[PDB]
């Protein structure tokens, strides 16, 4: 399953380097989550392999 990562306040994380963006990848595998691959796609840290128990963007009714 693929999804987008959020931020502390819930906002997303856009980047200026598309493609293998270590920044997004590092923030993807951050800790226990199951992110097999995490790169920036469409100006944003995108990840693939997030369990349903993982919070992704956008957020619930409580958007940023």
Swiss-Prot record:
It comes from the Eukaryota. GO terms for biological process: defense response. The modification Cysteine amide is found at residue 64. It is found in: Secreted. Its main location: secreted. Disulfide bonds join 11-64, 15-40, 24-45, 28-47. Keywords: Amidation, Disulfide bond, Ion channel impairing toxin, Neurotoxin, Secreted, Signal, Toxin, Voltage-gated sodium channel impairing toxin. The keyword tRNA-binding does not apply. GO terms for cellular component: extracellular region. Expressed by the venom gland. Residues 1-64 form the LCN-type CS-alpha/beta domain. GO terms for molecular function: sodium channel inhibitor activity; toxin activity. Belongs to the long (4 C-C) scorpion toxin superfamily. Sodium channel inhibitor family. Beta subfamily. Has the structural arrangement of an alpha-helix connected to antiparallel beta-sheets by disulfide bonds (CS-alpha/beta). Beta toxins bind voltage-independently at site-4 of sodium channels (Nav) and shift the voltage of activation toward more negative potentials thereby affecting sodium channel activation and promoting spontaneous and repetitive firing. Affects channels from chicken and frog. This is Beta-toxin CsEI. The chain holds residues 20 to 83 of 86 of the full protein.
């Amino acid at each position: 399953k693929d999804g987008y990562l959020v931020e502390k306040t819930g906002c997303k994380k856009t980047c200026y380097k598309l493609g293998e963006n270590d920044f997004c990848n590092r923030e993807c595998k951050w800790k226990h989550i199951g992110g097999s691959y995490g790169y920036c796609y469409g100006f944003g840290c995108y990840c693939e392999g997030l369990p349903d128990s993982t919070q992704t963007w956008p957020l619930p009714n409580k958007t940023c």
